[PDB]
């Protein structure tokens, strides 16, 4: 509470009016952190782990969103808080009751610390409404979002690689989540989606939307550690020297060995890898850094200053996205427990199709109309849709 009271005191310089509220956000933030850590435990799910990082992410997320965001009222700040609260903590939660448990906790927290009645519904929907299409990250209209996304998804489906795809509300929520995640300063994400859920291709969509350079590590059974180093090595150089802002997509297919686990335990957690640039290779990098720095209009005296600028560059401009399927097997669970992963990865839980979106997919595929005759029986007996057509019958059977 003391640590993060200092943090809020630092980020609230952007909203001096609300300066008085430094402690109760810090208190409410640590409270939530404690309760969450208490309610959801590793006995239920392997990935329920909470560390101070979650408190770190919550402040950081709020900082950027305030800074980039519109003029704030108290309601504005505390809802924004609740958004980041949702994404940092609850987005990892499976099922429903647990997400509802979190909503209840959120309501309780707000009531206990910051009692304003100007709030609306604070549930996971009714809040996030996270502006991307709108230039400053405000709340949005939701009809505009779905359309913007859909036209930019039509564009992306045609312009970039063509794997026929389908849209659903389900997609939209996770899209906002992936984008907001790639917007946050030092941050990475892991999508637990089962498989075929369309999580990699969605990452790629946002990467295409925000014009981030996509890198998928190319490896195999004979692939070495020296090989993965060079990928990371080159990826970092571009993230710093050329200001490329790259998104590195790791699948669980990609790992033939754990060596991939660890070197990133580093890159995620802290902002650099010390071993990676070494020997003369270090001096070459340093030279370049001096040049780029001086070209930015900053002459940095010491060497560590250059390297401090460099690391900060890796932090804000390099995002990593894991996509894993079955957290339950030992191969992925090695990825899972591993803390530097789970605690600097924003865990986002997708799963098998929603059985509703199964219809949205099905219906959008049978959109072409070969379908004939009459329904002798408007269904008279007995979740896809209210069933009228042969179309609906088919997607219900399937």
């Amino acid at each position: 509470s003391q640590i993060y009271e200092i943090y809020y005191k630092a980020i609230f310089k952007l909203v001096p009016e609300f300066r008085s509220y430094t402690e109760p956000f810090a208190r409410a933030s640590v409270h939530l952190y404690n309760e969450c850590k208490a309610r959801y435990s590793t006995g239920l799910q392997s990935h329920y782990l909470f560390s101070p990082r979650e408190l770190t992410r919550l402040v950081r997320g709020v900082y950027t969103a305030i800074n980039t965001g519109p003029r704030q009222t108290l309601r504005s700040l505390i809802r924004l808080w609740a958004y980041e609260a949702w994404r940092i903590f609850a987005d990892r939660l499976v099922g429903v009751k647990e997400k509802n448990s979190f909503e209840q906790l959120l309501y309780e927290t707000v009531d206990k610390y910051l009692p304003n009645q100007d709030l609306g519904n604070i549930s996971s929907t009714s809040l996030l409404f996270s502006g991307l299409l709108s230039l400053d990250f405000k709340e949005v209209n939701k009809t505009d979002l779905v359309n913007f996304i859909e036209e930019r998804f039509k564009t992306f489906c045609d312009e970039e690689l063509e794997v026929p795809m389908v849209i659903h509300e389900s997609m939209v929520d996770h899209i906002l989540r992936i984008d907001r995640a790639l917007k946050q300063v030092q941050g990475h994400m892991m999508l637990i989606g089962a498989s075929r859920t369309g999580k990699t291709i969605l990452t790629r969509f946002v990467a295409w939307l925000n014009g981030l350079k996509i890198v998928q590590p190319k490896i195999h059974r004979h692939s070495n550690l020296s090989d993965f180093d060079m990928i990371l090595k080159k990826a970092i150089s571009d993230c710093s020297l050329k200001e490329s802002r790259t998104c590195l997509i790791i699948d669980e297919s990609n790992i033939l060995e754990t060596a991939f686990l660890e070197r990133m335990n580093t890159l995620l957690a802290n902002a650099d890898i010390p071993d990676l640039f070494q020997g003369e290779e270090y001096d070459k990098l340093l030279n370049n850094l001096r040049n780029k720095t001086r070209s930015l209009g900053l002459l940095l005296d010491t060497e560590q200053e250059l390297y401090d600028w460099f690391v900060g560059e890796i932090a804000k401009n390099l995002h990593v996205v894991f996509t894993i399927c079955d957290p339950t097997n030992n191969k992925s669970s090695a990825m899972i427990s591993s803390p530097a992963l789970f605690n600097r990865c924003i865990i986002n839980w997708m799963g098998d199709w929603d059985t509703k979106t199964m219809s949205q997919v099905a219906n959008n595929m049978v959109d072409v109309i070969p379908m004939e005759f009459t329904d002798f029986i408007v269904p008279e007996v007995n979740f896809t849709e209210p069933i009228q057509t042969i179309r609906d019958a088919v997607v219900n059977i399937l």
Partner: protein, 50 residues
């Protein structure tokens, strides 16, 4: 011949992913971009159900 063991260099080939050109069609494998034919077929084969 051994599907039992499978390395992801083929991953871009299993999922259908290709960067199209005017004439050529290319698929990244490992560190190199190779041209696909289209008279090309693939069959993965394994023996033990284990």
């Amino acid at each position: 011949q051994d599907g039992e063991f499978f390395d992801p260099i083929i991953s871009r080939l299993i999922s259908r992913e290709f960067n199209h050109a005017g004439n050529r069609v290319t698929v990244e494998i490992g560190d190199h971009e190779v041209d696909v034919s289209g008279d090309f077929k693939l069959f993965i084969h394994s023996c033990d159900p284990s």
